[PDB]
Design a protein around this ligand. Structure first.
Ligand SMILES: CC(=O)c1cc(F)c(Cl)cc1NCC(=O)Nc1ccccc1C(=O)O
Length: 521
């Protein structure tokens, strides 16, 4: 796959200092009649939901076989009495009574910068297995049910990729005169103030809850969530945290539930019209009614002003074409199916997806980025022509087609069988996923260009490699041939007709976000 094996680098703890100074800064919020009004409507909805506690066992089953006092995930999962009793002893320590966490640096694989420069590692912050399991018993059923109730269609994790595109496209198509933009808040977790976290608590507490549930949430909120001590791998003090911890069950929830309240309110201060938000973590997209180009521009510096006092990285750009808006590193693009009929789909710059694919050939990994990406980007031309080709060839060589693999989707861990990709993709994207062609020159160029930049063979070659793989999958039959038939129809001159798959007939997959949670489904 990759030749320029030098621009591909992972982030280590050497660069922690860098990330600490990008992460350390004082916070100062102001509230408005807007802010508050959002809040009241929120709680109005929040107080609508009956939430229930998870038994120690249910919390145990939700722990990943390889997640991080004397026991491990395996022990937790088997319901080991050493494990279950130690957990009971934090749960009770929790109903009767600041908690410690671990601060670590993340090792993610990127590629050297545009125009040079290597991004500093991200800082992970998680209690230990025992705490984590208590987080689920108390909150899990809340971070799995609140956002959608409070934020309605605005909550992003409720969507599969195909559903996101649809919502984005129809939302855009419904404005008489649409204007939109993305807004990335600088180190959102670091901008989360203690007050936000309590407000959060408040909304959690708005829910029809279990007596101890509330007791446990409050404890967690004050003991674990508003902040606390920070310990490194060795065992020394690295400090204290007064904002959002990244590796706790509620982190995704809080950010989405928070970013929403700030933007939603800042959209009232900016006086921008029929504001529709798509929120997931700290990434926000807004599609509203244009008030005119210059009024829009002016109107957007006010949205910025208001976010700040409740900041951005790059200043937000007003946009009048949906494909031009970028969020989650993704942008909508269009192609045509087997009838020339236009199909919109989500795509992204393919550098990180390919870079981590390269890193995945060198060292087999804990989490298969390649598969996830195939699943989330099945309709894109780079994911079909390169990723599916490259990895099915590998699965063929090492004879691993049948081995299920651990895939992460929206921070949640899943067990997926490669041979199931056909059915899955039919579900998350529709049959068009297997007939898309006539991609945008722009899209084609970013891809064609990224291939040079990284030094991976050109598309024409992948097409041949695919004709070969396709052939070998067809020769083995069953699910594999179907993988050959459906996944590589794009690679042959005379296409075969792709009828809807029988076995294509995937809910838990897009309900909520669990980033930095410890979820296994
Ligand atoms: C919510 C979000 O970030 C997202 C939603 C989508 F609808 C699509 Cl298309 C892409 C997204 N993010 C960029 C990305 O690269 N995501 C992933 C890639 C592989 C496996 C999992 C994810 C993930 O976002 O969980």
């Amino acid at each position: 796959l990759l030749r320029h094996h030098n621009m591909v680098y992972a982030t280590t703890s050497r660069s922690a200092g860098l990330r600490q100074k990008k992460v350390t800064f004082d916070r100062l919020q102001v509230l408005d009649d807007h802010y508050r009004d959002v809040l009241k409507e929120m709680k109005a909805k929040a107080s609508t939901v009956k939430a229930k506690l998870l038994s120690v066992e249910e919390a145990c089953k939700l722990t990943p076989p390889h997640s991080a006092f004397g026991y491990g995930a395996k022990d937790v999962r088997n319901l080991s009495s050493k494990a279950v009793n130690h957990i009971h002893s934090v749960w009770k320590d929790l109903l009767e009574d600041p908690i410690d966490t671990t601060i670590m640096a993340k090792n993610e694989v990127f590629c050297v910068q545009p125009e040079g420069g290597r991004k500093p590692a991200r800082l992970i912050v998680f209690p230990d297995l025992g705490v984590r399991v208590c987080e689920k018993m108390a909150l899990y059923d809340v971070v799995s049910t609140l956002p959608q109730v409070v934020m309605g269609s605005s909550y992003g994790f409720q969507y599969s990729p195909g559903q996101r595109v649809e919502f984005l496209v129809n939302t855009w198509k419904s404005k008489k005169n649409p204007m939109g933009f993305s807004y990335d808040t600088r180190c959102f977790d670091s901008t989360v103030t203690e007050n936000d976290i309590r407000v959060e608590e408040s909304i959690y507490q708005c829910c029809d809850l279990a007596p101890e549930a509330r007791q446990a949430i409050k404890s967690l909120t004050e003991r674990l969530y508003i902040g606390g001590p920070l310990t490194n791998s060795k065992g020394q003090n690295c400090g204290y945290r007064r904002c959002r911890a990244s590796g706790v069950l509620t982190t995704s929830c809080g950010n989405t539930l928070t970013c929403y309240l700030k933007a939603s309110a800042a959209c009232r201060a900016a006086k921008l019209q029929d504001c529709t938000m798509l929120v997931n973590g700290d990434d926000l997209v807004v599609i509203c009614e244009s008030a005119g180009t210059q009024e829009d521009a002016a109107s957007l510096r006010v949205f910025t002003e208001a976010m700040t006092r409740y900041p951005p990285g790059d200043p937000p750009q007003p946009e009048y074409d949906l494909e031009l808006i970028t969020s989650c590193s993704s942008n909508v693009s269009v192609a045509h199916d087997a009838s020339g009929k236009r199909v919109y789909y989500l795509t992204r710059d393919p550098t990180t997806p390919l870079a981590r694919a390269a890193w995945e050939t060198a060292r087999h990994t804990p989490v298969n980025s390649w598969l996830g990406n195939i699943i989330m980007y099945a309709p894109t031309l780079w994911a079909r022509m390169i990723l599916m080709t490259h990895f099915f060839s590998i699965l063929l060589a090492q004879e691993q087609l049948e081995k299920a693999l651990d895939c992460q989707i929206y921070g949640a861990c899943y067990s997926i069988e490669p041979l199931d990709l056909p059915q899955i993709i039919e579900r998350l994207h529709g049959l068009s996923a297997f007939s898309l062609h006539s991609y945008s020159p722009g899209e084609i160029n970013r891809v064609a260009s990224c291939l040079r930049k990284l030094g991976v063979p050109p598309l024409r070659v992948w097409r041949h490699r695919a004709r070969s793989v396709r052939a070998r999958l067809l020769s083995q039959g069953g699910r594999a041939a179907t993988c050959g038939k459906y996944l590589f129809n794009w690679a042959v001159k005379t296409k075969l007709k792709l009828t809807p798959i029988p076995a294509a007939s995937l809910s838990g997959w897009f309900v909520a976000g669990y980033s930095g949670g410890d979820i296994y489904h």
